[PDB]
Amino acid sequence: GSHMLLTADTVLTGTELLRPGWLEIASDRVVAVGAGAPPAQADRNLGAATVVPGFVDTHLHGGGGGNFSAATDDETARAVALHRAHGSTTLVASLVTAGPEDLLRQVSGLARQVRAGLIDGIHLEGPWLSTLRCGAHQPVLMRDPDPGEIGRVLDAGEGTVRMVTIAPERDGALAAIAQLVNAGVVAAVGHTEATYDQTRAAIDAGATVGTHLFNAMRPIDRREPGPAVALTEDSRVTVEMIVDGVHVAPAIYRHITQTVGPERLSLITAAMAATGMSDGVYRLGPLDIDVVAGVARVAGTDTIAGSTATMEQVFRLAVAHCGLPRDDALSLAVRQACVNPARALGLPAAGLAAGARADLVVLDHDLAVTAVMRAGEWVVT
Amino acid sequence: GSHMLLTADTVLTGTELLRPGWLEIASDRVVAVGAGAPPAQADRNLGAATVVPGFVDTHLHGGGGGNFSAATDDETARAVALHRAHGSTTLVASLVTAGPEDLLRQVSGLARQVRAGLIDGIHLEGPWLSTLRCGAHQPVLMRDPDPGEIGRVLDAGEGTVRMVTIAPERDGALAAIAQLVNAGVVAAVGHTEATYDQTRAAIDAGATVGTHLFNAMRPIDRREPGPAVALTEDSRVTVEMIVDGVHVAPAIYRHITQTVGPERLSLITAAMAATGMSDGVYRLGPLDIDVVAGVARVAGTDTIAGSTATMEQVFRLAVAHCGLPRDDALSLAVRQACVNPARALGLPAAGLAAGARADLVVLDHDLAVTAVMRAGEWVVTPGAA
Ligand SMILES: CC(=O)N[C@@H]1[C@@H](O)[C@H](O)[C@@H](COP(=O)(O)O)O[C@@H]1O
Ligand SMILES: [Cl-]
Ligand SMILES: [Cl-]
Ligand SMILES: [Zn+2]
Ligand SMILES: [Zn+2]
């Protein structure tokens, strides 16, 4: 654009709650943001709306019928369009376990769409995972992390692979974590039967993210705490959680938030390709997924295979279920849905502040998305 | 009575860490506490020792060969003498699940020792329980909480029953919790297969304590969190934890401390009658117990017969495993072993402060007890441990 001055009764910047607030947008940047009456006459008076920074979804597999694992322009476009429509202005595309050949093709294909700007990075969830915690993955393809293949895969992405999930109990997992962190890649722990001690070792080797805490993860036990306690204990780790109301009980979300504090939890969707569509049978990598009432299940089991949630939905549920008063709930959920995930992944600092890119979301009273701006242009006007 | 002046390199009062510190004792009361040099020449300089308030053990079954469930002067005296020598200056004696007539006799007999001053209260850990997990005491006598029997048992205690463990899923549990709170008794949640929702209902009905969190309790599951999460979530609840290194992993104790904060965890021993006994085989109530390297087992079996922890041991393990630097660790451990449990049970607020009873413990640099004072007199005088 050129000159936009927005007002709204509430503006959350990432670190403060402005009531009322205003933002001045020039081209694709925020030039200025503040509380009270605006420094000039406003162009857009949003009224009784809440403005938050754009949502930063760092772990999702598709949407609107599109699968990121397809690594085609059409499927990526329809996934990006749906999530962007719901306020996810930054997206890390996740790949499920795959054979070496398909992995290179998928990484190369997605890396092109990063460079094109459709997605902001690649997450490799697999193949270096535990077969005991596979879920919606093909366990046959999981393998020990080999430093030759890791280098080949990172070479193919040309710096666009941002995060790799590792099962810390596989042979060569601790070397692979060091190898990833030397390449500037975030090492995440997930899909693992690791003990407390093995997860603690992975953290000391440089893992800094917990992949959807409590899902595909050994449970907490009084004598063997398991990975979830190692991950919540260490302040260097940002834990992911899927708060769609299906993957973990809301009281678990509340418990972990209590434990790790406001800066150490990231909300994610793990959205699959049926997000935004109708019910039926779908595809995730090389698997068939039956979505019944929006609940994704691997065809023929009881295993939930991913969510059908957008960041707008998990934001709303975080606010409702975090147990804090409304204003504090909004502030917390903005840290979890915008600030913490961008920080954890080395992404452009989320936040509405002078010089930041103008990515923001307008929420109505019920906290539904009414507008979405990305790079200073309305995606949803 | 005259004023005794004590000095030590470090005095923890329950809220402050004084370095150096001093305390003035008159009769059985603390007169004054302060930092720096004493007001006069001290009657005893404890030197390079750390003084803490007396330990408050709110859940234990015996020690030194005595079972509180015996409800005799001889068994209670032996248990009290053992734990007192390791710094527990306040004790709440626990009874396991028992038959209705045996329950009344045990309560009646322990109430007399409350009135005599050997113990400070009674905890009924049973019979209104409902778990078969390891830790179950006598599950064939577990039964629904009948308000008639509760009134009869509370009457028998003449106000000395301070805590009652309730499994929240039994018919009548929520009513029993309301009945206990109205009678001024603490309702604890424990020995239960209750869901998260059923436990949160018990908390809304007035339960304020979790009986040895994670032990004898449904575990945490991602879709059914179980009672431990309801108990850690609610600020009204003080959770018990047995930190002897065996009942819960040290990192679980850190996790829970990190979750609930410094005010909401109590260290307990759940000590059984073999606590503090030398290696050997012993007749303790209805069981032959074999003690090997301080671990008690029923003779002829590999099965561990419960905790043999003293408050001295759990305090030292709490300081070692809480993951804080030493001074912050001592300050947390004093809250968990002294202030939080006394407050949860409505006991005389622990702490070395003007007006408080003179109950304190002297520890060396290894955090071993070297002296114990209770009501202004040395139970264990410095050097005699
Ligand atoms: C793509 C993928 O792997 N998604 C996982 C799924 O595998 C797992 O079954 C589910 C719950 O796992 P849980 O039953 O251990 O919580 O979480 C995620 O949806
Ligand atoms: Cl997932
Ligand atoms: Cl016990
Ligand atoms: Zn995933
Ligand atoms: Zn007990």
Residue numbers in the entry:
A (entry chain A): -2 to 378
B (entry chain B): -2 to 382
Sentences from the paper on this structure:
To investigate the interaction of the GlcNAc6P substrate with the protein, we mutated Asp-267, which has been shown to be important for catalysis in other NagA enzymes, to alanine. The co-crystal structure shows clear electron density for GlcNAc6P in the substrate-binding pocket of Chain A, enabling the substrate to be modeled in the active-site pocket at the dimeric interface. The GlcNAc6P substrate is situated in the cavity of the (α/β) barrel of domain I at the dimer interface, recruiting Arg-219 from the opposing monomer through an interaction with the phosphate moiety. The carbonyl group of the GlcNAc6P substrate is positioned ∼2.5 Å from the M1 metal ion, which is ideally primed to stabilize the transition state intermediate formed during catalysis. We therefore modeled a cadmium ion at this position, which is likely to arise as a result of the addition of CdCl2 in the crystallization conditions with the metal-binding site perhaps being destabilized by the D267A mutation. The M2 metal ion is similarly coordinated to Glu-122, His-188, and His-209, and it is striking that an additional interaction is formed with the carbonyl group of the GlcNAc6P substrate, replacing the water molecule in the apo-structure.
Domain II is a small β-barrel comprising eight β-strands contributed from the N and C termini of the MSNagA protein (amino acids 1–51 and 344–382).
